[PDB]
Structure 1
Amino acid sequence: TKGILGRKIGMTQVFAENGDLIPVTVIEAAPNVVLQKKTAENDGYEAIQLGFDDKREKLSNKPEKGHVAKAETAPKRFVKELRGVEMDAYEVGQEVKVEIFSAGEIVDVTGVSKGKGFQGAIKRHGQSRGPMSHGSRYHRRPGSMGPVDPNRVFKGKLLPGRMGGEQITVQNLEIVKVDAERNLLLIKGNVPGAKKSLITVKSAVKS
């Protein structure tokens, strides 16, 4: 498999080869430098480390500076592993760019979703709402916790809490256009997360 990880900028619309109008998500995801190659005889599994969005030396630690010394590159903000890529096909310090994806391919997009704060059960779990009239004092409440006989609430009872901030994967999106000059990926559909957050684009599980 193949993949690359970067920052998304925002959404736009692009018409392509017909009159049809396509919702397009823009992702800056290049260049990515291979930092570490995981091997089965040493680490127990096969993976590669990709680094993205290098930063100033003031914001990087001495272990972070020493970890990227082997790849001959600046310390980078985002490090994630890809598993399992076609071993080996990449050497340590080789730049991964957006040219690996053609503009007709099917990819998997994952990322940390937008935070919503501590929210009620109606918004967090999609639970239906109580009546506002005919004497009713009941609305926006989670419901009965369960029966009487267990003398307890069963685990998994849906209750208000914090929504968002979790990893969400959207499957089988399509690349609309690839921009090798400006390091941009144009992806059909919606992408989870807020603006300028980390987005990982990996090849889909075919077929």
Structure 2
Amino acid sequence: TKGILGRKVGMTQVFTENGELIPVTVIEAAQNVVLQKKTVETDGYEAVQIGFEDKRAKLSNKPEQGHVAKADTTPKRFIREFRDVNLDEYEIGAEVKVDVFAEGDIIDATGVSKGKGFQGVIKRHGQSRGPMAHGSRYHRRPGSMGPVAPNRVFKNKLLPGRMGGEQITIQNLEIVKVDVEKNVLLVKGNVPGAKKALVQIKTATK
């Protein structure tokens, strides 16, 4: 089990040696370091804490600056944890490189979706419209709220609200090419989030 953090750079395509053409998404994973190690004698569970991007000392405060100084490095912008990983490696303060992966591994991508605002029930939940001719006055409405007997409306009655912006993971997603010098990672397919988002890449659970 491995894992790094990176930013979603863009979206493109490459030609394989076979001849076919595949879409890939580019992820840049520079400057991530191991910060803290969580153990079962001290915390109750085993994990590693990784920080991703250096940021100006103007933007960081004393608590987090002391936390990162404990591992002899500069304050980081993104900090996350990885479980199900082997604690024998990951010396505190050591850096994680994209070469932990290799061409052909199957990974998992985790990120926060693009944000859609207050969206209706047809975009949000994929409902069906009513007729838009033949005298109808019912086009993009939710539906019946339920029967009469309960004197109330049940839960999970799907209604309009804020649409996007949740955590999404999509899995069993192959890797294509690793460039160590440019700290990039070409991985085949889509990942959630807008450009410049944070993407958490780790070995497939299954």
TM-score, normalisation: structure 1: 0.98
1:47 and 2:50 are equivalent in the alignment: no
Distance (whole Å) between structure 2 residues aligned to residue 180 and residue 53 of structure 1: 17
d(CA) in 1 for partners of 2:131, 2:195: 38
Residue 57 of structure 1: SS of its match in structure 2?
A: coil
Are positions 1:130 and 2:102 aligned together? Answer: no
- Structure 1: where are the runs of 5+ without partners? none
Q: Give the structure 2 partner of residue 180 of structure 1.
A: 180
Aligned AA for 2:16? A
TM-aligned CA deviation for residue 89 of structure 1: 1.1
Compare 173-182 and 85-94 and name the one that shifted more.
85-94
Q: Which SS does the other structure have where 2:178 is aligned?
A: strand
SS at match of 1:68: helix
Task: Determine which structure has the larger strand proportion and give its number.
Answer: 1
Q: Is the 8 A contact 2:145 2:153 kept in 1?
A: yes
Give the structure 2 partner of residue 141 of structure 1. Answer: 141
Q: Give the match's secondary structure for 1:43.
A: coil
Alpha carbon RMSD of aligned pairs, Å? 0.7
Deviation at residue 87 of structure 1 after TM alignment:
1.9
- Normalized against structure 2, the TM-score is what? 0.98
Structure 2 unaligned blocks of 5 or more:
none
1:199 Cα shift?
0.4
Q: Give runs of ≥4 in structure 1 deviating > 3 Å.
A: none
CA contact (8 A) 2:5 2:201 kept: yes
Q: How many residues align?
A: 206
Contact kept, 8 Å, 2:31 with 2:54, in 1: the verdict is no
Per the alignment, residue 156 of structure 1 pairs with 156
Question: Deviation per CA, 1:23-55, whole angstroms, max 9, x where unpaired?
Answer: 000001133100000000001100000000110
Report what 2:89 is aligned to: 89
- Residue in 2 that maps onto 1:6: 6
- Residue 86 of structure 1: how far off its partner (Å): 1.0
Aligned amino acid, residue 90 of structure 1: Y
2:74 is matched by which residue type in structure 1? A
- 1:165 — aligned with what? 165
SS of corresponding position for 1:66:
helix
- CA shift for structure 1 position 97: 0.8
Query: How far has the Cα of 1:120 moved from its partner?
Result: 0.2
